[PDB]
C-alpha cells in the first residue's frame, strides 16, 4: 500500500470558538482528523499519526503510532491557550520526522491554521526554502481568516511547492455554514 | 436583541460613529475577539463618560453571555463602570455576579479578589481588606509569574501604604515593583510622584538598613535626572556614607511633614552606616580601631558610644565583640550590600596574590616532592 | 453543558485504567499459582515507632 | 546550560515530580567531580525579578552499595584502596 508518515498540527487559540462560523469547529476538524486517520487506517493500517499543537510552548501530545485508540482520547483537553507559533511549529515536526520507526515511510505533514501568521515574508521564504530544500510534502490548510485569505501565502506555496508533477496541493476553504470535512476531502490528499 | 441593537448602535454622538462603523461591522461579522479588541479601543480612548452608560451595560451583557473571550476584559470594563458611576453598593453585586458567571477555566480569582479588595480599600474597611489581600498573595504562588497581577497587587500595597500603620511592606513590594518594570511606556509625569513617594517611602522604610538596592538599579537613577537633584544628592549621601552633618541636616529639615518624629530613628539608622563603612574600608593592616573615629564621625559624646555599639549589636548586622581594656573598637563580619569598586580592584589584587601564592607553594613543594616521592 | 464536557476525558482515563489492569492483574495467576508447602501463622502486632 | 532546559525540564515537572538536573562533561578531562545535582525549584529574588526556575547546586557523592565496588575494583586492577600511611597521604598532599 502507501507507506508514509502523517503529522497534523491543530490550533489551540481562542479564534476557534467564534459564533459566526461552525459551533466550535474544533470538534469538526477533530472529526476531520478522525476520518483521515480512519481513512488512512483503511488504506494502510501501518501508517503512524502524530499530534501536536502550534502554541508557544509546543508539546508532543502523542508519538507517531498507528494505534489511534488512545489518540482519540488525546484529542481532548486541548488546553486553549496561546495564539499562534509558526517557526517552532514547523521545526517541531519537520525536524522530528527522523524519529519515526519505519524509515521507508514518506514524509507528509499537514497543519490546521486558525490564526493570522505573525511571521514576515522573510521567514516565509526562509522556511519555504528549508522545506523545499529537505523535500517534505507540506499541505497548508487555513481555517478562518481576518484579512484576505491568500496574499503572501500564494507566493509562499508557489515557492514552497516543488516537484510540480503530482506534488503538494493547497487547501483554501471559503466561508460557509457547511462542514469542512467534505471540503477538505475534495483534493487527492484525503484517500 | 441583535436586530434591536442597530437602532441605538447607529444613533450616537458626533465623533462616536468613527468607532461605531468598525464596531457595527465587527458586530455583524460576529467576531467576538475583534469585537473585544474594539471594545478595549473604545474604553482606552478618552471618551466623554456621558453617553457610554448604554454601551457599558450592552457590552456588559454581551460579555456575560458570550462565554468566549477572556473575562479579564470584562473585569477592566466593569472597573470602568464602577469608576464612572462611583456606586460601591452595586459593586459587590456586580463583582460577585462576575464570580458566579466566570466558570472554572482560568484562574481569574486573583484578579477578581484583587478588584474586590481594591474597591474595598476605601475608608469603609481596612482590616478585612488586608486579610483578603493576604489571601490574594496566598492563593496562587504557582508558575504563572507574569507579575502584572502582582503589579496590581503592588497598587493594593500602595492603597495599603496610604495607611501609616506599616511602611516596611511597601518597600518589600516596592523592590518587586523595582524589578517588574519592563519599559518606559507608562507616563513619566506619573513616574515623578512614583519616584518621589518611592524615595521618601524608601527613606522612611525601617525594615532595611542599606539603601543601595534602590539606587543600584539604573532605572531609578535614569528616571530621576529630570526631577530636581535635591533628592538624588541626599540618596547618594545616604548610600555612600554621611561624613558631614550639614547636608543631612538641611535635607533632614527640608521635608517638613512626618519627618520630625522619624528624624531620630533615621539618625539611629544612619549611625550604623559609618560603622559598616569604617570596618569595611580597611580590610587588613590593624583592623583594630578606637572610639575616637566613631565619636568624631557621629559628633557624639564618649558616654553614648556604648549604647551606640549596643544598638549596633542589637540590630544584628554586626557580631563584633571587643575584649579591650582601654577603649577600642574591634569589628567582625559585615556586608556592604551596595557596591565597592576599590574593593573590586583590591579584590583582584588580593585574589591574584592568593592565587599566585598557592601556585608558588604548589610548584615549590611539588617541584622536588614529585622528584623524590612521586 | 460546556463544563460537563471534561467528563469524557475522565471516562477515557478510567477505561484506560481498566485496559491497563489486565497485565498486572494477569500476573496474579502466574505468581499466586500454587503454594508448594504449608506454614503455620501466629499473629503478633508490632509497632514501628506512614 | 542552555535556555531550552527550562522547557525540557518543564515536561518532567508537569508529568513527573520535581526533577533533579545533572550537568556532566562529554570529555573526562575535568579534574573536578563530574556530577552536580541541580534541583528544579522556583526561588524568590530580592531584586524584584519575576519568579523563574532556578538550579541550586545540591552536593553529590559517588558510591556503590554491594557489587559495583567489586566489579570496578576487578576491572581496574590499578587503583588502590584507602591504604593509610605514606603514599596515599603524600600523593594528596602533593597534587
Amino acid at each position: 500500500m502507501v507507506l508514509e508518515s502523517t503529522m497534523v498540527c491543530v490550533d489551540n487559540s481562542e479564534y476557534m470558538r467564534n459564533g459566526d462560523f461552525l459551533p466550535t469547529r474544533l470538534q469538526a476538524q477533530q472529526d476531520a482528523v478522525n476520518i483521515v486517520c480512519h481513512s488512512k487506517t483503511r488504506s494502510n493500517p501501518e501508517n503512524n499519526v502524530g499530534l501536536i499543537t502550534l502554541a508557544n510552548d509546543c508539546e508532543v501530545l502523542t508519538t507517531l503510532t498507528p494505534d489511534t485508540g488512545r489518540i482519540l482520547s488525546k484529542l481532548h483537553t486541548v488546553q486553549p491557550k496561546g495564539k499562534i507559533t509558526f517557526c517552532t511549529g514547523i521545526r517541531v515536526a519537520h525536524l522530528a520526522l527522523k524519529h519515526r520507526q519505519g524509515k521507508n515511510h514518506k514524509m507528509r505533514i499537514i497543519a490546521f491554521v486558525g490564526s493570522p501568521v505573525e511571521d514576515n515574508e522573510k521567514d516565509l521564504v526562509k522556511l519555504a526554502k528549508r522545506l523545499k530544500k529537505e523535500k517534505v510534502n507540506v499541505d497548508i490548510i487555513n481555517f478562518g481568516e481576518e484579512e484576505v485569505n491568500t496574499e503572501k501565502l500564494t507566493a509562499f506555496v508557489n515557492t514552497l511547492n516543488g516537484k510540480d508533477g503530482t506534488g503538494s496541493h493547497l487547501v483554501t476553504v471559503p466561508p460557509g455554514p457547511s462542514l469542512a470535512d467534505a471540503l477538505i476531502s475534495s483534493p487527492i490528499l484525503a484517500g | 436583541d441583535v436586530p434591536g441593537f442597530l437602532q441605538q448602535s447607529q444613533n450616537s454622538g458626533p465623533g462616536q460613529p468613527a468607532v461605531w462603523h468598525r464596531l457595527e461591522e465587527l458586530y455583524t461579522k460576529k467576531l467576538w475577539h475583534q469585537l473585544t479588541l474594539q471594545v478595549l479601543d473604545f474604553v482606552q480612548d478618552p471618551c466623554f463618560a456621558q453617553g457610554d452608560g448604554l454601551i457599558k451595560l450592552y457590552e456588559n451583557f454581551i460579555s456575560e453571555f458570550e462565554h468566549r473571550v477572556n473575562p479579564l476584559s470584562l473585569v477592566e470594563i466593569i472597573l470602568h463602570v464602577v469608576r464612572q458611576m462611583t456606586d460601591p453598593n452595586v459593586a459587590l453585586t456586580f463583582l460577585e455576579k462576575t464570580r458566579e458567571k466566570v466558570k472554572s477555566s482560568d484562574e481569574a480569582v486573583i484578579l477578581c479578589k484583587t478588584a474586590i479588595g481594591a474597591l474595598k480599600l476605601n475608608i469603609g474597611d481596612l482590616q478585612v481588606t488586608k486579610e483578603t489581600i493576604e489571601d490574594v498573595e496566598e492563593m496562587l504562588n504557582n508558575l504563572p509569574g507574569v507579575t502584572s497581577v502582582h503589579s496590581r497587587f503592588y497598587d493594593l500595597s500602595s492603597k495599603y501604604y496610604q495607611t501609616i500603620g506599616n511602611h516596611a511592606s511597601y518597600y518589600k513590594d516596592a523592590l518587586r515593583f523595582l524589578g517588574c518594570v519592563d519599559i518606559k511606556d507608562l507616563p513619566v509625569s506619573e513616574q515623578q510622584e512614583r519616584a518621589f513617594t518611592l524615595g521618601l517611602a524608601g527613606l522612611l522604610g525601617e525594615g532595611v538598613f542599606n539603601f543601595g538596592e534602590l539606587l543600584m538599579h539604573p532605572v531609578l537613577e535614569s528616571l530621576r535626572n529630570t526631577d530636581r537633584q535635591w533628592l538624588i544628592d541626599t540618596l547618594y549621601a545616604f548610600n555612600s556614607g554621611n561624613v558631614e552633618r550639614f547636608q543631612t541636616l538641611k535635607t533632614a529639615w527640608g521635608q517638613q511633614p512626618d519627618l520630625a518624629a522619624n528624624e531620630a530613628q533615621l539618625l539611629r539608622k544612619i549611625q550604623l552606616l559609618c560603622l559598616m563603612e569604617m570596618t569595611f574600608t580597611r580590610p587588613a593592616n590593624h583592623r583594630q580601631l578606637t572610639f575616637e573615629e566613631i565619636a568624631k564621625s557621629a559628633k557624639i559624646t564618649v558616654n553614648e558610644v556604648e549604647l551606640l555599639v549596643m544598638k549596633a549589636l542589637s540590630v544584628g548586622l554586626v557580631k563584633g565583640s571587643i575584649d579591650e581594656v582601654d577603649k577600642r573598637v574591634h569589628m567582625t563580619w559585615v556586608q556592604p550590600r551596595v557596591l565597592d569598586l576599590q574593593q573590586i580592584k583590591g579584590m583582584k589584587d588580593r585574589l591574584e596574590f592568593w592565587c599566585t601564592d598557592v601556585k608558588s607553594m604548589e610548584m615549590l613543594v611539588e617541584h622536588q616532592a614529585h622528584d623524590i616521592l612521586t | 453543558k460546556i463544563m460537563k464536557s471534561e467528563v469524557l476525558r475522565v471516562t477515557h482515563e478510567l477505561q484506560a485504567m481498566k485496559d491497563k489492569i489486565k497485565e498486572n492483574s494477569e500476573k496474579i495467576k502466574v505468581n499466586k499459582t500454587l503454594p508448594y508447602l504449608v506454614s503455620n501463622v501466629i499473629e503478633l502486632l508490632d509497632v514501628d515507632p506512614q | 546550560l542552555h535556555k531550552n532546559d527550562i522547557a525540557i525540564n518543564e515536561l518532567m515537572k508537569r508529568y513527573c515530580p520535581n526533577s533533579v538536573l545533572v550537568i556532566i562533561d562529554v570529555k573526562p578531562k575535568d579534574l573536578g567531580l563530574p556530577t552536580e545535582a541541580y534541583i528544579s525549584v522556583e526561588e524568590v529574588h530580592d531584586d524584584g525579578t519575576p519568579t523563574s526556575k532556578t538550579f541550586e547546586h545540591v552536593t553529590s557523592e559517588i558510591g556503590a552499595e554491594e557489587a559495583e565496588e567489586v566489579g570496578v575494583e576487578h576491572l581496574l586492577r590499578d587503583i588502590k584502596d584507602t591504604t593509610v600511611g605514606t603514599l596515599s597521604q603524600r600523593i594528596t598532599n602533593q597534587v
Side-chain angles (χ1 to χ4, degrees):
Chain A
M1 295 296 172
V2 48
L3 293 173
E4 66 183 2
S5 66
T6 300
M7 291 297 291
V8 61
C9 185
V10 296
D11 192 1
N12 57 2
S13 66
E14 60 186 359
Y15 292 165
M16 309 298 282
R17 290 181 289 117
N18 47 2
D20 53 355
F21 288 164
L22 278 75
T24 312
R25 89 295 313 275
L26 179 64
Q27 187 177 2
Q29 65 182 358
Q30 179 180 0
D31 292 331
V33 177
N34 294 324
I35 62 170
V36 302
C37 78
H38 291 88
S39 179
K40 291 293 183 182
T41 303
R42 289 291 300 274
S43 70
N44 193 0
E46 294 294 327
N47 293 118
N48 48 1
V49 175
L51 183 62
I52 195 164
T53 187
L54 49 93
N56 193 1
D57 193 0
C58 293
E59 297 175 356
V60 176
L61 293 174
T62 303
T63 316
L64 285 81
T65 180
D67 193 1
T68 187
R70 60 183 179 270
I71 299 174
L72 295 173
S73 66
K74 292 295 186 291
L75 287 173
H76 199 71
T77 179
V78 75
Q79 293 180 357
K81 65 183 181 180
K83 295 183 290 294
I84 192 169
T85 310
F86 194 70
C87 182
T88 200
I90 282 177
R91 295 180 184 272
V92 82
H94 289 277
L95 189 63
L97 290 173
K98 294 182 184 293
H99 292 88
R100 66 186 184 273
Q101 182 179 1
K103 294 181 176 67
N104 202 4
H105 292 88
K106 296 183 290 294
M107 296 180 285
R108 182 185 293 272
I109 295 177
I110 64 170
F112 291 163
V113 176
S115 298
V117 54
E118 293 179 353
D119 289 332
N120 54 3
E121 188 178 1
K122 291 174 71 175
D123 291 331
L124 293 174
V125 70
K126 286 180 176 67
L127 290 174
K129 185 176 174 66
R130 181 68 176 172
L131 297 179
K132 186 179 183 293
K133 179 67 175 67
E134 64 180 3
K135 293 181 181 179
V136 174
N137 193 357
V138 178
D139 291 331
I140 295 95
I141 296 169
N142 294 317
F143 284 163
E145 75 271 14
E146 179 181 359
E147 201 67 28
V148 70
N149 292 113
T150 58
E151 185 176 1
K152 296 182 290 295
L153 277 76
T154 300
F156 173 72
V157 172
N158 288 119
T159 55
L160 187 142
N161 190 1
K163 192 178 288 293
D164 199 2
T166 184
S168 67
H169 297 285
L170 178 59
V171 176
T172 60
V173 50
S178 296
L179 297 174
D181 294 330
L183 270 71
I184 68 169
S185 179
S186 178
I188 203 167
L189 56 93
Chain B
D1 292 331
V2 177
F5 188 73
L6 294 174
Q7 288 83 17
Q8 66 268 18
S9 79
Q10 184 178 2
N11 290 318
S12 63
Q16 279 75 15
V19 298
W20 276 100
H21 281 91
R22 294 291 185 269
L23 186 60
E24 75 182 2
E25 286 293 327
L26 295 175
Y27 182 75
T28 53
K29 291 296 290 183
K30 204 178 262 78
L31 291 173
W32 300 98
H33 188 271
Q34 298 296 321
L35 186 68
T36 300
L37 292 176
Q38 190 62 255
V39 166
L40 270 72
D41 289 331
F42 180 75
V43 176
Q44 187 62 255
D45 289 331
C47 295
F48 296 99
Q50 184 178 2
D52 55 355
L54 294 175
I55 197 170
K56 291 293 180 68
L57 185 65
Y58 290 162
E59 293 295 327
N60 192 359
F61 286 164
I62 291 169
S63 296
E64 280 179 353
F65 88 103
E66 69 180 2
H67 67 83
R68 177 184 177 273
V69 193
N70 196 359
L72 302 184
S73 296
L74 180 60
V75 175
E76 294 178 353
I77 195 169
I78 204 165
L79 286 173
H80 294 88
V81 167
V82 70
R83 184 177 292 172
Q84 182 181 1
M85 188 63 72
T86 67
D87 193 0
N89 291 319
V90 298
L92 278 76
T93 62
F94 287 164
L95 294 173
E96 186 177 1
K97 187 180 289 293
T98 60
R99 290 177 63 88
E100 195 270 331
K101 182 63 69 178
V102 171
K103 66 181 287 185
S104 296
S105 66
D106 52 350
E107 293 292 328
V109 72
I110 32 92
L111 284 172
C112 292
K113 291 184 183 293
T114 296
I116 291 170
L119 267 64
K120 284 182 170 64
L121 276 170
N122 201 359
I123 203 167
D125 196 358
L126 295 175
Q127 180 179 0
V128 182
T129 67
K130 185 258 289 181
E131 184 177 1
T132 191
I133 280 169
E134 185 177 1
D135 185 74
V136 165
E137 69 179 0
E138 189 67 28
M139 279 298 290
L140 290 180
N141 291 317
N142 288 318
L143 70 156
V146 184
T147 320
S148 180
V149 55
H150 197 76
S151 179
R152 292 182 61 86
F153 180 79
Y154 174 75
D155 293 331
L156 270 69
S157 73
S158 297
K159 297 296 289 184
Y160 182 75
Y161 176 71
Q162 296 297 109
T163 305
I164 319 296
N166 192 1
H167 296 287
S169 66
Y170 182 72
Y171 186 76
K172 300 284 103 175
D173 202 1
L175 297 175
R176 178 70 68 191
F177 179 73
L178 185 145
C180 76
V181 54
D182 290 331
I183 55 174
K184 308 298 183 289
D185 55 355
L186 68 99
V188 183
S189 180
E190 294 293 327
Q191 289 171 352
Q192 181 178 2
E193 288 85 5
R194 291 291 183 184
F196 188 71
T197 195
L198 182 63
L200 292 177
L203 181 63
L204 294 174
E206 296 295 327
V208 71
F209 62 96
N210 194 0
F211 288 165
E213 187 175 2
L214 189 143
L215 187 62
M216 184 179 72
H217 209 279
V219 301
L220 289 180
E221 66 183 1
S222 68
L223 282 179
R224 280 194 292 265
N225 54 4
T226 302
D227 293 332
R228 185 63 63 193
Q229 293 179 356
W230 72 274
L231 185 63
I232 296 96
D233 195 2
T234 185
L235 285 175
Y236 184 76
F238 286 165
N239 196 3
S240 296
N242 300 112
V243 75
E244 77 272 16
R245 294 291 182 268
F246 185 75
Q247 291 185 358
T248 191
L249 185 64
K250 289 294 183 71
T251 195
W253 288 99
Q255 187 65 255
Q256 186 63 255
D258 291 331
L259 200 65
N262 294 114
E263 183 178 1
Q265 190 175 4
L266 289 175
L267 292 174
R268 292 181 179 91
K269 182 179 70 65
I270 65 170
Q271 71 182 357
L272 307 177
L273 182 62
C274 67
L275 296 176
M276 58 178 284
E277 290 182 355
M278 81 182 286
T279 186
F280 198 74
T281 298
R282 298 290 298 274
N285 298 115
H286 188 72
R287 173 84 76 189
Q288 185 66 254
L289 293 173
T290 188
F291 287 98
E292 293 179 353
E293 186 68 28
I294 297 171
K296 182 176 73 175
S297 296
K299 64 184 288 184
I300 202 66
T301 188
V302 193
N303 291 318
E304 294 292 328
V305 300
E306 292 86 4
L307 277 75
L308 192 143
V309 300
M310 184 180 288
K311 183 67 181 294
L313 294 174
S314 296
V315 174
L317 55 92
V318 66
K319 295 179 182 179
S321 66
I322 317 100
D323 201 359
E324 87 280 24
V325 176
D326 189 74
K327 53 181 178 67
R328 291 180 186 271
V329 177
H330 182 74
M331 288 290 109
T332 56
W333 174 71
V334 75
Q335 185 177 3
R337 191 64 177 85
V338 42
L339 189 63
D340 271 326
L341 55 94
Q342 63 183 357
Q343 297 295 321
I344 287 169
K345 293 180 176 66
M347 181 182 71
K348 297 186 287 184
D349 185 74
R350 180 66 66 192
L351 187 65
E352 193 272 332
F353 187 67
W354 197 279
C355 182
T356 192
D357 284 329
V358 173
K359 185 185 287 185
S360 69
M361 294 299 291
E362 189 270 331
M363 293 177 70
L364 191 144
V365 175
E366 193 267 334
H367 184 273
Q368 63 266 13
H370 182 74
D371 291 332
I372 67 173
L373 296 170
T374 305
Chain C
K1 65 182 181 180
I2 188 167
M3 188 177 73
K4 273 78 175 176
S5 179
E6 294 293 327
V7 185
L8 277 76
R9 179 66 178 171
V10 177
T11 59
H12 287 87
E13 290 181 354
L14 295 177
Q15 71 182 358
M17 191 68 202
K18 270 79 173 178
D19 288 331
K20 73 178 73 174
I21 50 97
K22 291 182 181 180
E23 291 86 4
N24 54 13
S25 74
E26 193 270 331
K27 73 176 184 291
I28 303 298
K29 296 182 289 294
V30 298
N31 292 117
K32 267 67 72 176
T33 164
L34 54 100
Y36 79 104
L37 59 77
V38 175
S39 179
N40 192 0
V41 176
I42 294 172
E43 181 64 27
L44 190 146
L45 183 63
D46 198 359
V47 51
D48 185 74
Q50 183 66 41
Chain D
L1 186 69
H2 283 88
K3 187 177 179 180
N4 202 5
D5 289 329
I6 187 169
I8 301 166
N9 199 1
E10 189 68 28
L11 188 143
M12 291 185 185
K13 188 175 181 180
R14 297 189 305 272
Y15 290 97
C16 301
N18 46 1
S19 296
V20 66
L21 197 144
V22 173
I23 290 174
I24 59 173
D25 195 0
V26 291
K27 269 75 176 175
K29 294 180 176 67
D30 194 1
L31 192 143
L33 208 152
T35 300
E36 286 87 0
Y38 294 157
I39 187 167
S40 176
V41 291
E42 292 180 353
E43 293 179 353
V44 175
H45 200 273
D46 199 3
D47 202 5
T49 61
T51 302
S52 179
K53 188 180 287 185
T54 303
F55 290 160
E56 185 178 1
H57 175 73
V58 178
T59 181
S60 179
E61 62 182 1
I62 303 299
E65 192 264 326
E66 182 68 27
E68 195 170 5
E69 287 179 354
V70 180
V72 164
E73 185 179 1
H74 180 74
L75 287 170
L76 283 173
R77 283 287 183 265
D78 197 3
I79 198 169
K80 199 177 287 188
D81 292 331
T82 304
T83 65
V84 184
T86 170
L87 53 98
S88 296
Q89 195 172 5
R90 75 175 182 260
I91 289 169
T92 59
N93 300 132
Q94 281 179 357
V95 198

